[PDB]
C-alpha cells in the first residue's frame, strides 16, 4: 500500500509544485507537500508561517495535522495510516519536520531540492536516518525530483525577503 | 540544591587558550593604585577586559603581595626591563620590580570549570564563581517548580510527565504553562509544542512569526529534535532544563542552539532543579 502511491509520483509532485508556487505568491517559503495513503491524498500543506504568525507551521506540519484530522474524522488509527503514507514535498524537510515525520513513522519521503539552510535529511543534520532510538523510526528518501524547478522557487523567495 | 551548567558548542567548551603577557611585582604596595592608573593608561588591554590587572597572592604566613599586569607580550616574548616596557614620564615605575612573562587567558571564561583553569593563571572576571545571583537562582527555581507541577498534573492524568513554562524576562511574567498533551489522535503535542502554540495565540495582530523572540523557556527535561528545532525556528532566547533526555537536542545528541550554519543561536543551561526533574519523563 506504500509503493502503490509511488505509481503516480509525477501527479503528486506536480500538485506539490503547484502549491509551492502559491506559497511563493503569498510571500511564504515556497514549499508544497502532499501526503498519499492508498493512492488517495489524505493531507496537504504549504508553509504558512507568515500568514499564521507561527514559525512551526511548515508545510509538512500542516500536512501532518490534516492527515490526523482525516484519521480522527474516519475512525482510523494514525499508526496504520501514517505507516503506509508517502510524503511528496518540493524541498528536503528541515530538522524539525524530519523529526516530526520520524515520530509519525512515515516510511518514505519523495522530495525535490536540498534545504541548505535547515535540511534534516542530510544538508545540515541527517535526522531522517540518524540512530535516534527514542525519536520514532528513521525514514527513507527519494531526493532530487524536479529539484531544479524547486530550488529556483527557493532562490526567488530568498531574494525577495528582507 | 542545584547548579546551572551552560551547554556550549564543542568549540566553546574546551580549555581557554593562553597568551603571553608581562607582569611585574609591586614591591611598594602603597604605589599600587598610582601604578595601576599610569600603566593601564599606557596599556589599556582593550581586547582583554576580562583580566584583572592586579594579582594578589598570600604567603604561607598570610602576608599579602601583588603583581601588576603591564601589557601583552610582543612577537618576541623575550626578557624585558621596566625601562623597555614603560614609557617615561608617562609612568613613574618606582615601586615595581623586574617584569616577567606570564600566560593569561585570551578570552573570558564561560563555564565554571573554564573559570577555574583561568583563575589559576591570572585573575579573571566572570559574569565569587557564581553563574546566577541569589535573586536569579530563586526566580529560576520558581518557574521550574511551575514546570514540575505541570509535569506532575500530566502524570496524574496519564500523560507523558513533561512540563514547560515560557517567561518574558523583561517583566518576569509567565506567558504560558503547559505539559505534554500527546494522545493517539494527536501524537506531536509535546510540552514545548503546546507552549509555542499558547504563546502564539496570545500575540497581537502586528506580530512576527518568531513567536518566542526574547523569551525564556523552562522545561523539566531536555527537548527532543522536533521541539529543540522548533525553538530555533521560533527564536527562543534562553532555555533552562532540568535533566537531559536520551535523544535530547540541546546537549545530549545534538546542540542545535549552538550552530554556525543555522540562522539563530541561543543560550542553554542544564541542571535547574535536576533532582526533581530527573524523575519525570524524557522528551519524547
Ligand atoms: Zn520544516
Ligand atoms: Zn519533543
Q: How many C-beta atoms surround the C-beta of residue B50 within 10 A?
A: 20
Flag whether B128 is in a domain: no
Distances (CA, A) of B225 to B112, B142, B193, B230, B246: 27, 26, 12, 8, 11
- Rounded CA-CA distance A20/A30 in Å is 5
Looking at residue B174, which CATH number applies to its domain?
3.40.140.10
Quick one: angle between helices A95-104 and B225-234, nearest 10? 150
Q: Which single residue is written with the C-alpha cell 530555533?
A: B232
Asked if residue B2 lies in contact with residue B274, where contact means CB atoms within 8 angstroms, the answer is: yes
Q: How many C-beta atoms surround the C-beta of residue A84 within 10 A?
A: 19
Burial group, residue B12, by CB count within 10 angstroms (0-12, 13-18, 19+): middle
Judge if B114 and B139 occupy the same domain.
no
Judge if B108 and B138 occupy the same domain.
no
Flag whether B117 is in a domain: yes
Quick one: angle between helices B191-201 and B225-234, nearest 10? 20
Our count of domains for chain A comes to 1
What residues contact residue B74 under an 8 Å CB cut-off, 6+ apart?
none
Which phi and psi angles does A17 have, rounded to 5°? -70, -35
Flag whether B284 is in a domain: no
Range of the domain at B59: 5-121
Our count of domains for chain B comes to 2
Could you confirm whether A60 is annotated as catalytic?
Answer: yes
Q: Cell for A152?
A: 529556483
Closest Cα to residue B32, out of B82, B97, B101, B125? B97
Distances (CA, A) of B28 to A157, B32, B91, B92: 68, 7, 15, 13
- Rounded CA-CA distance A40/A36 in Å is 5
Flag whether B79 is in a domain: yes
Q: Number of CB pairs < 8 Å for A and B?
A: 98
Q: Which of B72, B98, B121 is the last residue of a domain?
A: B121
Judge if B76 and B147 occupy the same domain.
no
| Helical spans, DSSP H, in chain A | 3-6, 9-25, 49-52, 59-73, 78-82, 95-104, 147-160
Judge if B260 and B177 occupy the same domain.
yes
Closest Cα to residue B142, out of B129, B130, B131, B132? B132
Judge if B141 and B263 occupy the same domain.
yes
**Start-to-end C-alpha separation, chain B:** 26
Using DSSP's 3-state secondary structure scheme, residue A84 falls into: coil
Closest Cα to residue A147, out of A115, A106, A108? A115
Flag whether B282 is in a domain: no
Distances (CA, A) of B98 to A54, B22, B154, B219: 64, 10, 68, 55
Q: Consult the annotation and say whether B224 binds a ligand.
A: yes
What residues contact residue B167 under an 8 Å CB cut-off, 6+ apart?
B143, B173, B174, B175, B215, B216, B217, B218
CA angle A81, B200, B220 (to 5 degrees): 75
Q: Cell for A149?
A: 524547478
Asked if residue B122 lies in contact with residue B16, where contact means CB atoms within 8 angstroms, the answer is: no
Judge if B159 and B87 occupy the same domain.
no
Asked if residue B179 lies in contact with residue B279, where contact means CB atoms within 8 angstroms, the answer is: no
Closest Cα to residue B39, out of B7, B15, B71? B71
Method by which the coordinates were obtained: X-ray
B 8-47 near A (Cβ less than 8 A): none
Residue A118 and residue B262: Cβ atoms within 8 Å? yes
Closest Cα to residue A6, out of A104, A153, A141? A141
Residue B185 and residue A53: Cβ atoms within 8 Å? no
What residues contact residue A140 under an 8 Å CB cut-off, 6+ apart?
A107, A108, A109, A128, A129
Nearest chain A residue to B233 by CA distance is A55
Q: How many C-beta atoms surround the C-beta of residue B76 within 10 A?
A: 6
Would residue B93 be called left, alpha or beta, if left means φ above 0 and alpha means ψ between -120 and 50 degrees?
Answer: alpha
Judge if B88 and B190 occupy the same domain.
no
Quick one: angle between helices A9-25 and A147-160, nearest 10? 10
CB contacts, 8 Å: A50 with chain B: 209
Asked if residue A121 lies in contact with residue A97, where contact means CB atoms within 8 angstroms, the answer is: no
Closest Cα to residue A9, out of A93, A86, A91, A115? A86
- Of the residues A28, A48, A60, A92, which is catalytic? A60
- Rounded CA-CA distance B226/B247 in Å is 11
- Rounded CA-CA distance A19/A44 in Å is 9
Judge if B172 and B227 occupy the same domain.
yes
Q: Which single residue is written with the C-alpha cell 514540575?
A: B148
Range of the domain at A44: 1-162
Quick one: angle between helices A59-73 and A95-104, nearest 10? 20
Judge if B181 and B114 occupy the same domain.
no
Judge if B147 and B252 occupy the same domain.
yes
Closest Cα to residue B191, out of B255, B144, B259? B144
CB contacts, 8 Å: A117 with chain B: 262-263
Judge if B181 and B99 occupy the same domain.
no
Asked if residue B242 lies in contact with residue B165, where contact means CB atoms within 8 angstroms, the answer is: no
Resolution in A: 2.1
- Rounded CA-CA distance B140/B138 in Å is 6
Q: What is the CA radius of gyration of chain A?
A: 15
Closest Cα to residue B67, out of B24, B21, B123, B36? B24
Flag whether B203 is in a domain: yes
Judge if B98 and B148 occupy the same domain.
no
Flag whether B227 is in a domain: yes
Q: Residues before each break in chain B (C–N > 2.5 Å)?
A: 127
Convert chain B into a string of H (helix), E (strand) and C (coil): CCCCEECCCHHHHCCCCEEEEEEEEECCHHHHHHHHHHHHHHCCCCCCCCECCEEEEECCCCCEEEEEEEEECCCCCCCCCHHHHCCCCCCCCCCECCCEEEEEECCCCCCHHHHHHHHHHCCECCCCCCCCCHHHHHHHHHHHHHHHHHHHHHHHHCCCCCEEEEEECCCCEEEEEEECCCCCCCCCCCHHHHHHHHHHHCCCCCCCCCCCCCCEEEEEECCCHHHHHHHHHHCCCEEEEEECCCCCCECCCCECCCCCCCCCCCEEEECCCHHHHCCCCCCC
Test mutation, A135, A137, A139, A162, chain B, max B CBs within 10 A: A135
Residue B262 and residue A54: Cβ atoms within 8 Å? no
- Rounded CA-CA distance B29/B36 in Å is 11
Asked if residue A19 lies in contact with residue A33, where contact means CB atoms within 8 angstroms, the answer is: yes
What residues contact residue A98 under an 8 Å CB cut-off, 6+ apart?
A120, A121, A125, A127, A128, B225
CB contact, 8 Å: B225 with chain A? yes
Flag whether B64 is in a domain: yes
- Rounded CA-CA distance B209/A70 in Å is 27
Asked if residue A24 lies in contact with residue A33, where contact means CB atoms within 8 angstroms, the answer is: no
Amino acid at each position: 500500500p506504500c509503493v502503490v502511491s509511488v505509481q503516480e509520483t509525477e501527479k503528486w509532485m506536480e500538485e506539490a509544485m503547484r502549491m509551492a508556487k502559491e506559497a511563493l505568491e503569498n510571500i511564504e517559503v515556497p514549499v508544497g507537500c502532499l501526503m498519499v495513503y492508498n493512492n488517495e491524498v489524505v493531507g496537504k500543506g504549504r508553509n504558512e508561517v507568515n500568514q499564521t504568525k507561527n514559525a512551526t507551521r511548515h508545510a509538512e506540519m500542516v500536512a501532518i495535522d490534516q492527515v490526523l484530522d482525516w484519521c480522527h474524522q474516519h475512525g482510523q488509527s494514525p499508526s496504520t495510516v501514517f505507516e503506509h503514507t508517502v510524503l511528496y514535498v518540493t524541498v528536503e524537510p528541515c530538522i524539525m519536520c524530519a523529526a516530526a515525520l520520524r515520530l509519525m513513522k512515515i516510511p518514505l519521503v519523495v522530495y525535490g531540492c536540498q534545504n541548505e539552510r535547515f535540511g534534516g535529511c542530510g544538508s545540515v543534520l541527517n535526522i531522517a536516518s540518524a540512530d535516534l532510538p527514542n525519536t520514532g523510526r528513521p525514514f527513507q528518501c527519494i531526493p532530487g525530483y524536479r529539484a531544479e524547478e524547486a530550488v529556483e522557487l527557493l532562490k526567488t523567495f530568498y531574494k525577495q525577503e528582507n | 540544591q542545584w547548579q546551572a551548567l551552560p551547554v556550549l558548542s564543542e568549540q566553546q567548551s574546551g580549555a581557554v587558550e593562553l597568551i603571553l603577557a608581562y607582569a611585574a611585582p609591586v614591591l611598594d604596595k602603597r604605589q599600587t593604585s598610582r601604578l595601576l592608573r599610569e600603566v593601564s593608561a599606557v596599556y589599556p588591554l582593550p581586547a582583554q577586559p576580562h583580566l584583572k590587572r592586579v594579582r594578589p597572592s598570600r604567603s604561607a604566613g598570610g602576608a599579602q603581595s601583588s603583581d601588576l599586569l603591564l601589557c601583552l607580550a610582543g612577537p618576541s616574548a623575550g626578557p624585558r626591563s621596566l625601562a623597555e616596557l614603560l614609557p617615561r614620564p608617562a609612568v613613574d615605575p618606582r615601586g615595581l620590580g623586574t617584569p616577567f612573562l606570564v600566560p593569561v587567558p585570551a578570552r573570558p571564561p564561560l563555564t565554571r570549570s573554564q573559570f577555574e583553569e583561568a583563575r589559576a593563571h591570572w585573575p579573571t572576571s566572570f559574569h565569587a564563581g557564581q553563574l546566577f545571583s541569589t535573586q536569579e537562582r530563586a526566580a529560576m527555581q520558581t518557574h521550574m517548580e511551575r514546570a514540575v507541577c505541570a509535569a506532575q498534573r500530566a502524570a496524574a492524568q496519564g500523560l507523558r510527565a513533561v512540563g514547560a513554562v515560557v517567561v518574558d524576562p523583561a517583566s518576569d511574567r509567565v506567558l504560558a504553562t503547559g505539559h505534554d498533551c500527546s494522545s493517539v489522535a494527536s501524537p506531536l503535542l509535546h510540552a514545548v509544542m503546546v507552549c509555542i502554540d499558547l504563546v502564539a495565540q496570545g500575540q497581537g495582530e502586528d506580530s512576527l512569526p518568531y513567536v518566542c523572540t526574547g523569551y525564556d523557556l523552562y522545561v523539566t527535561r531536555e527537548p527532543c529534535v522536533m521541539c529543540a528545532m522548533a525553538l530555533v525556528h521560533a527564536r527562543i532566547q534562553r532555555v533552562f532544563y532540568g535533566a537531559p533526555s536520551p535523544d535530547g537536542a540541546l546537549g545530549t545528541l545534538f546542540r542545535v542552539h549552538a550552530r554556525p550554519d543555522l540562522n539563530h543561536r541561543f543560550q542553554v543551561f542544564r541542571g535547574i532543579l535536576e533532582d526533581q526533574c530527573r524523575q519525570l519523563d524524557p522528551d519524547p
